[PDB]
């Protein structure tokens, strides 16, 4: 089990910007219907590694454009989200992305006021 | 109680962009004096539902502009934040927003180095 | 210990935009090699306090440009990150920033599929 135990988790994926459409499409296929994205900058500088973006080289300190995906789901569907993101986003090149999993204590739909499981459920996911 | 127990929680609200001023104003009124917002894109596609933005229709996979609000507070004031956001942001239409609640283990003010409760407290909240 | 106990934590720092290069450089020096930043707006309105940005005054409700830094690390290196950010970002003026610490249940590298400690480790941090 995920060590801080919780009813919900947020899957936070920082990936290449041009892969967002494909990952979103694939997530939709397995019933993931709530997704948030935003433009970010980052670096993930392992060892001496050099990353390519816009035909240019980026080492250590130098920032590279990325997109952050945020998906909030029940504990049980967390693995499917991670795997779906990996398949959709992976190129095999340095700089493919990092995923984080964070505990979420509650979910609330603004329109209705539904809390918890009812708020997380989208009426078309199987 | 919120299941992962914590001294602080982050209230994360993804809402319509044109409602930010009103929610911020209302939060200020009940003593919420620290707020972070950023521009995001998202979809929340329930069932066959269609969402309206810019006079246009958005179904499933198609991204819609939103704003993400982040408010970090003590456990006890979490309910007041959620409720204040809902009242300020709700229109009654599809796409009104989702709120998430996440545990926060610590808060630190950069200027002073104050940790925990002292760092969370803003000298004008009653 | 950080009250919600976890193998990893996300250090989330909202600071002045012109300090990002210096904080990033200093973090790189102590072996912090994974960093995400994004443009945000915020207010931190203590008491009657007035904040200066772009030569102008900002009180309460009025939003000010900031940058959000996100660094995910092992529990033990959390203090070094916080301290390094504070030294790099502090001016001594109102509006220097807030730092939040959140539990992270897992880390995954997209390129390889490495989970947990292997995914968090960057081959050049001592």
């Amino acid at each position: 089990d995920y060590i801080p135990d919780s009813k919900f988790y947020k899957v936070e994926a920082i990936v290449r910007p041009w892969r967002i459409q494909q990952v979103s499409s694939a997530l939709l296929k397995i019933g993931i219907r709530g997704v948030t994205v935003s433009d970010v900058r980052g670096f993930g500088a392992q060892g001496g590694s050099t990353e390519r973006h816009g035909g240019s080289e980026f080492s250590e300190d130098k920032f590279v454009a990325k997109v952050k995906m945020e998906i909030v789901v029940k504990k049980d569907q967390v693995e499917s989200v991670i795997n779906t993101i990996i398949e959709g986003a992976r190129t095999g090149e340095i700089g493919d992305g990092k995923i984080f999993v964070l505990p979420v204590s509650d979910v609330i739909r603004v329109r209705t006021g539904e809390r918890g499981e009812k708020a997380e459920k989208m009426t078309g996911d199987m | 109680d919120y299941i992962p127990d914590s001294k602080f929680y982050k209230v994360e609200a993804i809402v319509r962009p044109w409602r930010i001023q009103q929610v911020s104003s209302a939060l200020l009124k009940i003593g919420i004096r620290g707020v972070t917002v950023s521009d995001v894109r998202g979809f929340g596609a329930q069932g066959g539902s269609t969402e309206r933005h810019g006079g246009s229709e958005f179904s499933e996979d198609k991204f819609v502009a939103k704003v993400k609000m982040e408010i970090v507070v003590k456990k006890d004031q979490v309910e007041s934040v959620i409720n204040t956001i809902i009242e300020g942001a709700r229109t009654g239409e599809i796409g009104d927003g989702k709120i998430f609640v996440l545990p926060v283990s610590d808060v630190i003010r950069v200027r002073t180095g104050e940790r925990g409760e002292k760092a969370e407290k803003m000298t004008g909240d009653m | 210990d950080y009250i919600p106990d976890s193998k990893f934590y996300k250090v989330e720092a909202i600071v002045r935009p012109w300090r990002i290069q210096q904080v990033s450089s200093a973090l790189l020096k102590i072996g912090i090699r994974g960093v995400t930043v994004s443009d945000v707006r915020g207010f931190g309105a203590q008491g009657g306090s007035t904040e200066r940005h772009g030569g102008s005054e900002f009180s309460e409700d009025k939003f000010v440009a900031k940058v959000k830094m996100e660094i995910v690390v092992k529990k033990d290196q959390v203090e070094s990150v916080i301290n390094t950010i504070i030294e790099g970002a502090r001016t001594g003026e109102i509006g220097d920033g807030k730092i939040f610490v959140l539990p992270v249940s897992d880390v995954i590298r997209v390129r390889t599929g490495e989970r947990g400690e292997k995914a968090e480790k960057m081959t050049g941090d001592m």
């Binding site: - | 962009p17 044109w18 810019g54 006079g55 246009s56 229709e57 009654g92 | -």
Partner: protein, 281 residues
């Protein structure tokens, strides 16, 4: 010399919405009366000259009905919406675009401004999709998307847009769209300050009967309760729903006003009282 001291007093009212977009739906008794018609035109032109950015959206029911009965294919309406087969659709587009649209454009051109008349087809301004009751209604459309691109340079050149409420789906089939709907969704697309609907009543009434119970100002939550409680009915329900729909999308105010009143448009914008009901977001 009283004419200029009045002009001077309207200064703060003129300044308030300078550079702001305003979407006006013209129909009803304001259409059928030549005197009211020239007042609307006047008011539009004045607003344009005074620094506002008005857009006129029209319907034109009575004119359509006349030609349909000339052709022995008389009108059929279900809950305020016209049953529109392929033959009716052709006549609808003929009247709305070829008669009404160009009539308004020429009247504006003669009033010392310059208008450009467009349908949803032009510059792909609108794309339609079949309405939920399309099985009964035929080629009646909802707005699937708005592309306001074409309006950008026209407004920059100082032309007044005049919009006819027909459009096509993506395959090229023409659809008949409710003008209130077009006005509301167009306002949402432009991030308009105001949506203004001209109707045949004083505004929104507390009691369906007496016109002295007119509500001046109310919010989304307010009128949504008025629908549920049954205090508002009939043809006024679709109007309010279009107002809510565009308000929810970021339009600041939506007004339902009395088209029967001379210069109602100017009254709505240039006075604190208004000319009907203002609904706020």
């Amino acid at each position: 010399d009283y004419r200029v001291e009045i002009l001077s007093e309207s200064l703060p009212f003129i300044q308030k919405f300078r550079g702001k977009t305003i979407v006006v739906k013209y129909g009803g008794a304001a259409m059928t009366s030549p005197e009211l018609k020239s007042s609307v035109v006047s008011d539009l032109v004045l607003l344009a000259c005074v620094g506002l950015r008005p857009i006129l959206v029209h319907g034109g029911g009575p004119d359509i009905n006349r030609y349909l009965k000339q052709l022995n294919i008389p009108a059929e309406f279900r809950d305020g919406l016209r049953v529109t087969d392929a033959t009716t659709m052709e006549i609808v587009s003929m009247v709305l675009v070829g008669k009404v649209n160009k009539n308004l454009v020429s009247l504006i051109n003669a009033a010392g401004a310059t208008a450009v008349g467009l349908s949803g087809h032009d510059g792909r301004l609108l794309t339609a999709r079949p309405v939920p009751n399309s099985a009964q209604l035929g080629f009646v459309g909802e707005v699937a998307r708005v592309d306001p691109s074409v309006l950008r340079p026209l407004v920059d050149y100082g032309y007044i847009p005049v919009i006819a409420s027909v459009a096509a789906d993506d395959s090229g089939q023409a659809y008949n769209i409710n003008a209130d709907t077009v006005a509301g969704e167009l306002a949402a697309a432009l991030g308009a300050e105001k949506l203004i609907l001209l109707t045949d009543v004083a505004g929104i009434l507390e009691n369906k009967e007496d016109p002295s119970s007119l509500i001046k100002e109310i919010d989304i939550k307010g009128v949504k309760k008025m629908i549920e409680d049954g205090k508002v009915a009939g043809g006024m329900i679709p109007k309010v729903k279009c107002c809510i729909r565009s308000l929810a999308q970021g339009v600041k105010t939506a007004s339902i006003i009395d088209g029967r009143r001379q210069h109602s448009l100017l009254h709505e914008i240039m006075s604190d009282e208004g000319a009907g009901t203002m609904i706020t977001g």
